[PDB]
Amino acid sequence: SEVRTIKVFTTVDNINLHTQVVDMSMTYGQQFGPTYLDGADVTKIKPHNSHEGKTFYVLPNDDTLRVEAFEYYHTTDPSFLGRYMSALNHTKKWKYPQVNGLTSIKWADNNCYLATALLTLQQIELKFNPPALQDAYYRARAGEAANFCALILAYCNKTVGELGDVRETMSYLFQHANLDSCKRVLNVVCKTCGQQQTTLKGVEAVMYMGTLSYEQFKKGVQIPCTCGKQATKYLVQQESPFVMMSAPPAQYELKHGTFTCASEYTGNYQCGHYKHITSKETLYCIDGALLTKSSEYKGPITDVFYKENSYTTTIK
Numbered sequence: 590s591e592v593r594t595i596k597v598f599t600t601v602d603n604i605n606l607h608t609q610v611v612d613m614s615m616t617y618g619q620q621f622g623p624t625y626l627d628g629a630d631v632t633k634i635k636p637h638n639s640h641e642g643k644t645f646y647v648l649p650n651d652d653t654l655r656v657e658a659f660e661y662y663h664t665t666d667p668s669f670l671g672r673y674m675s676a677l678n679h680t681k682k683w684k685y686p687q688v689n690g691l692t693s694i695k696w697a698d699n700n701c702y703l704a705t706a707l708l709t710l711q712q713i714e715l716k717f718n719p720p721a722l723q724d725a726y727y728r729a730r731a732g733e734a735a736n737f738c739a740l741i742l743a744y745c746n747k748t749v750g751e752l753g754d755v756r757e758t759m760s761y762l763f764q765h766a767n768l769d770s771c772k773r774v775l776n777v778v779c780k781t782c783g784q785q786q787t788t789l790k791g792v793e794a795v796m797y798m799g800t801l802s803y804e805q806f807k808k809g810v811q812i813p814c815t816c817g818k819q820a821t822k823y824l825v826q827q828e829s830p831f832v833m834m835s836a837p838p839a840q841y842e843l844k845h846g847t848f849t850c851a852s853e854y855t856g857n858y859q860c861g862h863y864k865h866i867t868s869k870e871t872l873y874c875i876d877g878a879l880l881t882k883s884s885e886y887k888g889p890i891t892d893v894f895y896k897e898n899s900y901t902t903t904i905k
């Protein structure tokens with residue numbers, strides 16, 4: 590039969606586009622291997638006329654693309670790009686309303702942990718290392734978050750429709766962000782053992798599991814010693830843009846202007862519901878596209894974020 594062709598562009602990063610000529614007999618998979626158009630999988634689909642001039646994502650099958658993909662995504666996981674496109678295919682159908690001047694996500698496919706994490710990122714000082722996240726985050730901040738939510742799902746290895754833990758998500762995100770200058774100094778005192786001082790850098794310096802209260806962390810918290818007698822661990826110095834204080838969900842009271850934002854978890858382990866509480870002129874509770882205001886909030890809190898620059902203890 591007659592040989593028909595169109596010109597298209599193939600890419601890994603949507604920065605470097607490569608012109609390709611395609612046969613309208615064969616499928617995209619036959620010609621380039623797995624292929625995607627705005628996340629949809631067209632590997633088994635033959636070219637259409639409307640496809641002419643459009644940009645397609647493909648897998649790296651030569652050194653140029655591999656280098657391009659690594660520089661942009663800072664990963665070599667060969668499933669990464671297929672999971673990103675697979676996820677994006679769903680995240681592009683989500684609605685990202687501006688609630689309180691921050692970008693949220695209308696609830697779908699248990700995205701309540703992603704709404705809350707996205708709302709948190711817009712409230713704390715953070716620079717991602719992978720250009721893919723820098724670029725998607727900047728678009729997200731301005732109300733186009735479908736690529737950011739797709740990359741988060743891809744980086745966190747989560748499927749659409751699966752509920753995730755906000756503390757884990759953020760931890761993964763922190764690992765891909767520049768926190769080299771973040772420092773924390775802890776002191777532990779035991780009447781028997783003595784005083785021991787430890788320094789922490791990066792992600793370890795901005796996160797803590799076992800108390801929501803930044804103030805309690807500075808007074809001291811009780812922890813079990815190696816010896817077995819109770820010991821007091823307290824914060825001596827902290828240099829970071831913020832601190833994330835986590836604990837298993839507990840009835841907690843949040844007071845206006847004593848924190849930046851908090852994750853509220855209702856329900857049971859890995860099958861519950863997240864809400865985002867932020868401190869502005871009053872307390873705002875953001876629940877996807879839903880918003881309510883109050884001067885006071887008691888409820889089950891699991892993460893609390895506090896802004897910070899430089900703290901030093903006046904203890905001893």
Ligand SMILES: Cc1ccc(NC2CNC2)cc1C(=O)N[C@H](C)c1cccc(-c2ccc(CN[C@@H]3CC[C@H](O)C3)s2)c1
Nearest residue numbers: 752753754757837838839840854856857858859860889891
């Ligand atoms: C939602 C979710 C998804 C995935 C995972 N995956 C695991 C792999 N990494 C973690 C976790 C969770 C999770 O549920 N997290 C919450 C924070 C959480 C964390 C830890 C403990 C709990 C709970 C324990 C008991 C729970 C029910 N009771 C509430 C607690 C006191 C309130 O009065 C009522 S939740 C949850």
Ligand SMILES: [Zn+2]
Nearest residue numbers: 779782814816
């Ligand atoms: Zn001890």
